[PDB]
Design an enzyme around this catalytic site. Sequence first.
Site, mmCIF file in Angstrom:
data_model
loop_
_atom_site.group_PDB
_atom_site.id
_atom_site.type_symbol
_atom_site.label_atom_id
_atom_site.label_comp_id
_atom_site.label_asym_id
_atom_site.label_seq_id
_atom_site.Cartn_x
_atom_site.Cartn_y
_atom_site.Cartn_z
ATOM 1 C CE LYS A 163 -6.869 -7.428 5.279
ATOM 2 N NZ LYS A 163 -7.761 -8.683 5.078
ATOM 3 C CD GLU A 189 -8.431 -4.778 -3.053
ATOM 4 O OE1 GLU A 189 -7.749 -4.034 -3.252
ATOM 5 O OE2 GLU A 189 -7.574 -5.464 -2.112
ATOM 6 N NE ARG A 190 -12.196 -9.961 -1.175
ATOM 7 C CZ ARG A 190 -11.359 -9.790 -0.376
ATOM 8 N NH1 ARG A 190 -10.752 -9.074 0.012
ATOM 9 N NH2 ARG A 190 -11.032 -11.429 -0.387
#
Lengths: 465, 311, 56, 469, 462, 119
Positions: A163, A189-190
């Site tokens: 991805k 996002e992380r």
Amino acid sequence: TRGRVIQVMGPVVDVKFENGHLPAIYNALKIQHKARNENEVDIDLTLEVALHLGDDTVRTIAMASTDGLIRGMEVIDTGAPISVPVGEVTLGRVFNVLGEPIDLEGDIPADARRDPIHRPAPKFEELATEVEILETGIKVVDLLAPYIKGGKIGLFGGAGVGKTVLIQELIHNIAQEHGGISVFAGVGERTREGNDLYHEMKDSGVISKTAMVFGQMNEPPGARMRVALTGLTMAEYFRDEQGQDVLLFIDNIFRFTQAGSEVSALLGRMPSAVGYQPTLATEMGQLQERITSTAKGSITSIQAIYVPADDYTDPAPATTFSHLDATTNLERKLAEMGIYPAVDPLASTSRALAPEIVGEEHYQVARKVQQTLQRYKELQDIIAILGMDELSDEDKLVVHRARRIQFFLSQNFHVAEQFTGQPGSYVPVKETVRGFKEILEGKYDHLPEDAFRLVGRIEEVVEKA
Amino acid sequence: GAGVGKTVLIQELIHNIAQEHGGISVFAGVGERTREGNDLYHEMKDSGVISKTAMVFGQMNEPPGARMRVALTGLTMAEYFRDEQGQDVLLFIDNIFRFTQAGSEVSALLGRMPSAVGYQPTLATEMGQLQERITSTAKGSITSIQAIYVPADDYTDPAPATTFSHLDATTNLERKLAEMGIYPAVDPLASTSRALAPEIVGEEHYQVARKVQQTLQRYKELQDIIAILGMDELSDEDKLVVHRARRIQFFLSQNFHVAEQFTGQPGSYVPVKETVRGFKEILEGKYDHLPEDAFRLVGRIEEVVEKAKAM
Amino acid sequence: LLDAKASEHAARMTAMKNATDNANELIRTLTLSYNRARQAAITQEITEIVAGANAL
Amino acid sequence: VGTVIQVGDGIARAHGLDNVMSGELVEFANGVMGMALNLEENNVGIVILGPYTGIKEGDEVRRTGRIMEVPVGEALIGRVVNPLGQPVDGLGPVETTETRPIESRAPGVMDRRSVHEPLQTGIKAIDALVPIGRGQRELIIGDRQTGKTSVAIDTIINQKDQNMISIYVAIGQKESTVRTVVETLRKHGALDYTIVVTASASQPAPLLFLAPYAGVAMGEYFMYKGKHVLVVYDDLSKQAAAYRELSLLLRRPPGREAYPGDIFYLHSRLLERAAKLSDAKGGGSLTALPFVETQAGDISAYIPTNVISITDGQIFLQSDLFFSGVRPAINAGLSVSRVGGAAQIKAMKKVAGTLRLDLAAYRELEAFAQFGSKATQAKLARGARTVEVLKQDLHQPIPVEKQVLIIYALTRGFLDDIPVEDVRRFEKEFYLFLDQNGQHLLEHIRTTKDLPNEDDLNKAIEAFKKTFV
Amino acid sequence: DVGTVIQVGDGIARAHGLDNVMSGELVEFANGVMGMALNLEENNVGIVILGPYTGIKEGDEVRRTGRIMEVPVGEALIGRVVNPLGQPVDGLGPVETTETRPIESRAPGVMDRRSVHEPLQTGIKAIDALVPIGRGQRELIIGDRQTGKTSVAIDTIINQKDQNMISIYVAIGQKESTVRTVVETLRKHGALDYTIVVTASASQPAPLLFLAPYAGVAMGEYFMYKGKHVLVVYDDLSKQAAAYRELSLLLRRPPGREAYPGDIFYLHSRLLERAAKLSDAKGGGSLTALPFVETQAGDISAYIPTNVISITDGQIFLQSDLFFSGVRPAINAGLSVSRVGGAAQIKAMKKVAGTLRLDLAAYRELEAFAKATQAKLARGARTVEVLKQDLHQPIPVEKQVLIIYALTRGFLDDIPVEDVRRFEKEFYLFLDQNGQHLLEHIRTTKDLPNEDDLNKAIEAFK
Amino acid sequence: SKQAAAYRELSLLLRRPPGREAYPGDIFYLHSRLLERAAKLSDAKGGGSLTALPFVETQAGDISAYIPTNVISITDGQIFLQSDLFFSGVRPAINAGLSVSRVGGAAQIKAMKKVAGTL
Ligand SMILES: Nc1ncnc2c1ncn2[C@@H]1O[C@H](COP(=O)(O)OP(=O)(O)NP(=O)(O)O)[C@@H](O)[C@H]1O
Ligand SMILES: Nc1ncnc2c1ncn2[C@@H]1O[C@H](COP(=O)(O)OP(=O)(O)NP(=O)(O)O)[C@@H](O)[C@H]1O
Ligand SMILES: Nc1ncnc2c1ncn2[C@@H]1O[C@H](COP(=O)(O)OP(=O)(O)NP(=O)(O)O)[C@@H](O)[C@H]1O
Ligand SMILES: [Mg+2]
Ligand SMILES: [Mg+2]
Ligand SMILES: [Mg+2]
């Protein structure tokens, strides 16, 4: 006179402006505080105006942590929405939502021009009147799902199936083949995976040609909604003043709608159907409609998708899908065989594959691929239990051709070098039609099928065989 | 759930245990019908347990204020009996759900907002102040049985979810078993306890219990497959699972002593040794040829061969 | 008897091939009904909650 | 100083308190502490951490002048403490000198580092198929039962040789259960490297709200001083319940299921604090195992999907398989680890592929292909023996080396001659055989963390199979 | 006639003063944007903003237009793309229109209507052949996404040059790429010189999306009341319903099923009851409307599809499984009905090919089960193949009925299925050089020509 | 059931907040005030008998709804009339599996015990 705080409830803060010189909606306000004694704590919060309430009172949503506020403290005015620097200074760096860079490579000086975030969409008389197909150089993607300059494309796939390398290939191909600028935005996002992405970019020498914006998960919902529109300005300024095809990757639109849900629950609006905001169809549209193609250039976007409970009828997938022009899928069952990239040839769809857009021969060659792969897709079940040699001539020729269309999908990429040493190759769009037409007629049926693995031109395939 | 068979089992328990156990017994009713409460006092006056038992009532015909505190009144008695006098105590508490439900009805008038299905926001805070008071201490041992009514026969409800966290052993009742005519309606699958450990029940208990539990779990999906696929399309080895699980489930029924009104029968008595022994025989294959219907509402395994003799 | 035993397995093949189809349509329509039941339940719950909040 | 006006359900509203900051501690004459959470124009919302029955309207409230502080120290290990800094086990004070704030900022992206060093619990399934690194956060989601606490107990007990300062938290649970767990741990001496935080049901819900923040504040000090820390939660979803109650009593606007939208913030402000720090600040590392409650496996619910987004993986425990024999009920279908594939000893990486090439096919084919009786039946039989060999008995943690030895024994095809029921005996009598055969293999795996010479590795298997009964 | 604005929340505003303001009146802000009044409380007025509200501040001056919701109409808007408020989109100077119409006008009622007997030539074979339309009728176009609904409206509006019908195309909540593709197609084919295109894109505020169809019908009926014929099309009613839900939920009204307020049956009726065929007291003109509805999952039983059906006189439900089967447009021979009798079609159609609906629906059901039935199956494939057509090929009605006569009479049984679509293209090359008289006879008499000569024509081609 | 609806619509205009449905939460209390009024008085009271036969209707025969389950918790039994047996030819369509009676054989002539006590 600067504003004053009179009300704090977690992420949501109310401000007051005496004498009625209130600021505008979607403006930015800043607070600078430092402890005069041990009885105070330092904070540098900033706020965005969202609503007026009368009696010189305004509602604001927080952009960061908000603990330690005191009644009587002052908030200063800026006169314009949040602004991001644009120009040469943006490339090769990572920034937060507010604008400051996240790396230790220093700040950005104050002489560079800065562009706002909230601006009206481009008008009717400025749109491009032709379906100009963007050239990607990827063998399957250029055949089964052409991309449209100014349009939108969605990505589906299995867990962890390439991805991230399929994104970093496109930036390099844009730089090499046409030249351009790319921006990567992380919607809530992380914080951990940002480091992994940064290092995998750096070892490929690709970060130097892209600009990146992060909004972490520990940020409040006020800032997690604004990251995409923040990166959109950097993407747009290079399509406006300079001119060339620009890419704008969005990591996950689900968390954008979910941040909308959180902030709408916070704003006091009564939940709509399934709890979403009443303004669901207009707050998303303002993002989708800025990504267009004028007569001089284009912004094109690649987006990954999550579904709440596989319910396509859920309001968020329902409102998103109609705005998408192409969608492709990745299957792990093919990735287990090593076919990189393991893009699904059947679940991938696009509206551009029409004879009026691509011509008669390319339409025929693109559709007959899906037509002929269906025989293999259906016969694999009986093939898995009984041998092939006892079947009819049709099943034999289908297997014989499908084993080559199956392996031709692969192509070595430029980012693949740091783990598999290869020069990196490209597929011409005009040559792709010739190649697939020649394979589908059976002109290359005599070559060994696994020799078709990981390369981007049929002539090199001939040389390798 | 509603009308499953809780009260017959609870009265069997107070009949069997309190008659022998020397501990002070307290029975408290929170949400059952007044007729049962009035009948139980006369039955106690005949049973002779009245000398060693106290009771508290008020039941349905009063607003929530009494139905809330009627649960804690009996605990207030048991507390003094444990802390100072020091003898063992039995505490039966009946339909504590209505302690929760009552709290809903006043809540809307007290200024609290609704939540979830509609329960008051202080569910956990109100319930914990009760469920942690009934405990055994080093000074004295308290044995407590409680009745829980599922609001809508479905367990994914905040009240059962909050109640599930404090029990040491739970037995579930499914209305399907009530309609099947195999009483009591205890479902073996979802019934679990801390006692099922090798150092408390021994190895002769664990293996047999696990085998019976696993067989009754395995039969659950095969019987559903039978509903469509047929009855002989499945293999004979698969059909043997049904052939023995039917007997295993039927033998779970028991003829109680307090159900003599509904059954017209005096019942029978079994010790635990005979239970483990009988399950070992039923798995041994000694009773493959006795009809399934012969196993309905019997006690000791020795009765079954008589009932077949009766047939 | 051999001809009949071959035709028997052919008929069984056909029976399973017809039987395996309508299942997927029935699952997809029940799943749709399941999401609609979900959405209706959540909408009713939020409407009751917000009505109570507005009242109090 | 100000006055209290409204009291109820542990929530109070006060008039006064001009300079009270958000999160500032306040005190009453009765001595119970309170936290300010909402700041309105003419009233301040105080949330009380203790018994409130004695507070009356008109009581005076005093500002403390400081933020939440939690004392920390190495001597605390073994002691059982409240989420607040008070002794619950007695035995005098807590023996601490330094106090940390709870509002510590999460590490930046440039302060982190990739993770490739593992953590171990002693179970064949979790330690291999869903691997966890010493900087990873991993999610456990499930209904009541199915054996979720066993995972925590194995994770804590097995960390004997490998240094790891551990903090177990039990939130809102009955005190008898936590005492039973403590005594069971005491039978294995886990109190020498463990700290326990308990807040009982009788305690006010604010303590349940504050418990995990203390379960990370007490554990980050060993990190920032250069020590390796593990934190485990008995149940974290109860947070929401407390956060619901107070938030609803404070009249914050509802949400989807009365959960206010702050949940994503409230969880994240904690769960992002676990990291593998860089050398500029200190080479420590921390790992966390959050727990989530679920009603009959409805994974699509609000809180489960909310918490899934944050974590680097998921371990869902499935109930109808819990009675099939495999315990703890970890399913290989729903559980994947994005960080996995790196945090392993290289002995494991060389073999797990074949284990999947059997198990991933079995766990999808068995449900329908089992009825019809060479290659396919061989696959079925092999898969049956694999799913048999992954089981484990109650609380027998195994070191990593024996795990890789048995996984190599299974995958190579030497194990499939022992019949289905006797495998549970074989997996242990191998363990007893290896020690009397030799320690050299075990020493090599211990030092180099790599599979030994296969030509010599196979000899122990060959010699055993000649004597197995 | 002065006041101040004190709330600017989420596109809705509250205003002080405004003593003489009337309901439904236009209002202008000092920023230069139009708004409207919908509610008048004891001491404040509620205003809905019809543009970009980011420029409004507290204390802004707000002013009275002095009249009800009037939109300009006339011949000067022909050849332009206009905003619903009455502003040109592509420049080309200001509009010169003088006359105006209130878009809230009372619809014509009893003693002002008449039956329908004349067709609306669409040129799409499968529609006029199976589901006829007449002037004054309101036909629902409803179905799934990504199946080709707009491609029906475009073909229908290009075919109207020979009938001299001024028309309006309305785009609601739509992406500008498709809007400008359609506009370029119309300007290439020249339709813009008599059609009027109104657009309100997705990047526009909800109130414009909510008001667009009202202006689209108000600028269309004006030519009716002067005796001309008018066709009006709407791009999507689902988006208008969503915008109304948005506005109502911002206004704090109690939601109903699926949060849609109870005014849904009202709002659409006040929009869709404007279509009529006026009596001799006004003129013989007629208006037909083709509104569009998009189904979230293709299930008809939802709230909005049924409520929108309740007003309209028919529907064609566009499917998605037909889309991937190699058939366009996706038209179902089953559940799709029009209430107008067969006499609306020219008498030859009812005379010969009126059995097409039965012949096709019976086959569409019978194939699921699949000598007499063996012969019956052979006709269905030709029945579906002959009805196929490609993009921008509107066949003339005379040739249309001629090929339908050839199909229905069994002339095509020799032609293989895969070659059927070839015959159709070659056949018209034949008649223009051998049967030119039949076209004029059809155009004049509205009736089938001599049967013997029509039968004799075909053998020459065969 | 129509009396419950009447109580619901009486409560709504009084400005009293709703509950689990449009039905207010006091419904159980109301029924507890009603059904418990019956009694079988003892010998020292007069020895009378007041028995009731309430009727309740539910939408689509959903026995798991709020009103049916609320009502069942008070009464001494239930006769469940099922609509799909109604047309099959079993009149009255009493479901012999689901219906329950709590008093059982306490009030019954002793001839029936010897014959059909457990039928
Ligand atoms: N062994 C048995 N044989 C036959 N019928 C039985 C038996 N045990 C119980 N029943 C029937 O089941 C009914 C259960 O009554 P009861 O226990 O009061 O219901 P419940 O489960 O307590 N529901 P509730 O009382 O509203 O909380 C009895 O009244 C009998 O009619
Ligand atoms: N591997 C295992 N084999 C057999 N039984 C096990 C195993 N692991 C756990 N158990 C059982 O787990 C039980 C302990 O309760 P448990 O099911 O862990 O509670 P839980 O709900 O899962 N976690 P908690 O919320 O703290 O109660 C014991 O009775 C054990 O028999
Ligand atoms: N009758 C037809 N024959 C052949 N191709 C067609 C036909 N109708 C449409 N197409 C093609 O299919 C595409 C889709 O048509 P289009 O009218 O844009 O669908 P749509 O109605 O806009 N779907 P949606 O945007 O969800 O409402 C067109 O752009 C054409 O290329
Ligand atoms: Mg009972
Ligand atoms: Mg446990
Ligand atoms: Mg469309």
